[PDB]
């Protein structure tokens, strides 16, 4: 509606409603440069989709997980984060903890997937 | 914690807990050789992901199915398979039956999707 990055300056609670607009624009000798550009775009897309798969978020744009939020990563209240801040500011604020969060998300799915298997193994 | 393929010599049970350790390592004129190698890496990844999709296992690493084990592919009990065998030995042991198993998995999903559709058609 607003455009490819039209919500980039909007608050997180507004920009989160345009996730399909950005998602649909991630896929689409001089031949070498053009092919490298296309292969790189594909590789980045697949890295993100694989990472979502590892976390159990495949096929979703808004994925709820079982990892608790640590107040040391960000001590802002939920209203302050979603009503008075943009995603660029948040991305900067949480940059130093992103890999920590990603590790926990992987661990969470690893435990959950085993737990699902055990629930399914009950007769 | 053992790294990529670190569990290769471990038992199947222990190795089943390290799937995410190596899953991340499947995506990551001289320009053509490197570019073709990158494209092949993508094609192999996508063929495996498509095959998981056909079986109804998309987005999961440990996917349980409705295909019974027929005891002719391998007649070992779970104790020997999971606690006294590695994945390389298992892969060799049932290599000749993997195409049979994959075919059954495809057929199982084909029936399941129709059943889900029929269940979803009830008011």
């Amino acid at each position: 509606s607003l455009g490819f990055l039209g919500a980039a300056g909007s608050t997180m609670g507004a920009a989160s409603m345009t996730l399909t607009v950005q998602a649909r624009n991630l896929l689409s000798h001089w031949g070498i440069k053009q092919l490298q550009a296309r292969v790189l775009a594909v590789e980045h897309y697949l890295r993100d989709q694989q990472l979502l798969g590892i976390w159990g978020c495949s096929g979703k744009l808004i994925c709820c997980t079982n990892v608790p939020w640590n107040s040391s990563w960000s001590n802002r209240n939920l209203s302050e984060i979603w009503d008075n801040m943009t995603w660029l500011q948040w991305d900067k604020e949480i940059s130093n903890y992103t890999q920590i969060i990603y590790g926990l998300l992987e661990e969470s799915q690893n435990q959950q997937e085993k737990n699902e298997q055990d629930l399914l193994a009950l007769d | 914690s053992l790294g990529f393929l670190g569990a290769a010599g471990s038992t199947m049970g222990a190795a089943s807990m390290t799937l995410t350790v190596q899953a991340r390592n499947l995506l990551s004129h001289w320009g053509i050789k490197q570019l073709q190698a990158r494209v092949l890496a993508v094609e192999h990844y996508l063929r495996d992901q498509q095959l998981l999709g056909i079986w109804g296992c998309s987005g999961k690493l440990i996917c349980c199915t409705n295909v019974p084990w027929n005891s002719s592919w391998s007649n070992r009990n779970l104790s020997e398979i999971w606690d006294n065998m590695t994945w390389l030995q298992w892969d060799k042991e049932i290599s000749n039956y993997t195409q049979i198993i994959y075919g059954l998995l495809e057929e199982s999903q084909n029936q399941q999707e129709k059943n889900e559709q029929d269940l979803l058609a009830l008011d």
Partner: antibody, heavy 124, light 109 residues
Framework: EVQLVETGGGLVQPGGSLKLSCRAS????????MSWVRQAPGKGLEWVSL????????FYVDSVKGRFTISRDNSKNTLSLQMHSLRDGDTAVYYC??????????????????WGQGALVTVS | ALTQPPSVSGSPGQSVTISCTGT?????????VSWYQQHPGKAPKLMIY???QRPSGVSDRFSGSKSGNTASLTISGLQADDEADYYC???????????FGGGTRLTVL
């Protein structure tokens, strides 16, 4: 030889709480499921709760589902049960038992392999 | 939730049958019925599991079977040391894990 020894408490007043703790030895603790089974002084056995080998999954009888918490510590090789809101109907000998579940890659059980000595829990 | 007689008896050295009657959702659907021997003052011991399979350490005098929704344990060669309260444990699915209803006092004459 496999041993399970309960080190829990005795008499608690109605509405209070009591924690039981079972010390396990003689086997790899993390390889087996654990459960609590109770027997009223004049009755037969009653299953109370079941915990998986990793501790991630717990199951209870409906009569205690909102009152008892079952947990494990696989580094100390102990099983704990925290019983809240104790009722007069909960007076029983509580036995620590090994078995009751298999973690998908193990052969099936659905039976209890080892039983502890049993702690006597009473409610005034 | 299982029905089991409160007591049985028989001559020493002879066979006695102890049985539990359940329903289709427990004894019937699942072949996971086990039998326990509880001597007074002691914790129950496992005698039979998976309906017919005895654990190591138990003699061949204890053997079970099932038919329909009824499971039974036959104890041959009754000894003076076999006086105990016997119980069934049926698996009744993921909603109702175990049913321990019962308790048969075995008297050896």
């Amino acid at each position: 030889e496999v041993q399970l020894v309960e080190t829990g408490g005795g008499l608690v007043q109605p509405g209070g709480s009591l924690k039981l703790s079972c010390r396990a030895s003689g086997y790899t603790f993390s390889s087996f499921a654990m459960s609590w089974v109770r027997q009223a002084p004049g009755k037969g056995l009653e299953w109370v709760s079941l915990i998986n080998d990793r501790g991630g999954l717990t199951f209870y009888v409906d009569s205690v589902k909102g009152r008892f918490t079952i947990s494990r510590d696989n580094s100390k090789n102990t099983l704990s049960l925290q019983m809240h809101s104790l009722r007069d109907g909960d007076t029983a000998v509580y036995y620590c038992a090994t078995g009751g579940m298999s973690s998908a890659l193990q052969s099936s059980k659905y039976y209890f392999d080892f039983w502890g000595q049993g702690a006597l829990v009473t409610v005034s | 939730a299982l029905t089991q007689p409160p007591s049985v008896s028989g001559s020493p050295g002879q066979s006695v049958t102890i049985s539990c009657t359940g329903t289709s959702s427990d004894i019937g659907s699942y072949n996971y019925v086990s039998w326990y021997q509880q001597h007074p003052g002691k914790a129950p011991k496992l005698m039979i599991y998976d309906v017919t399979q005895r654990p190591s350490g138990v003699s061949d005098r204890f053997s079970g079977s099932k038919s329909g929704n009824t499971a039974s344990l036959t104890i041959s060669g009754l000894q003076a040391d076999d006086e105990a309260d016997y119980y069934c444990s049926a698996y009744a699915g993921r909603q109702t894990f175990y049913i321990f209803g019962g308790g048969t006092r075995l008297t050896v004459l």
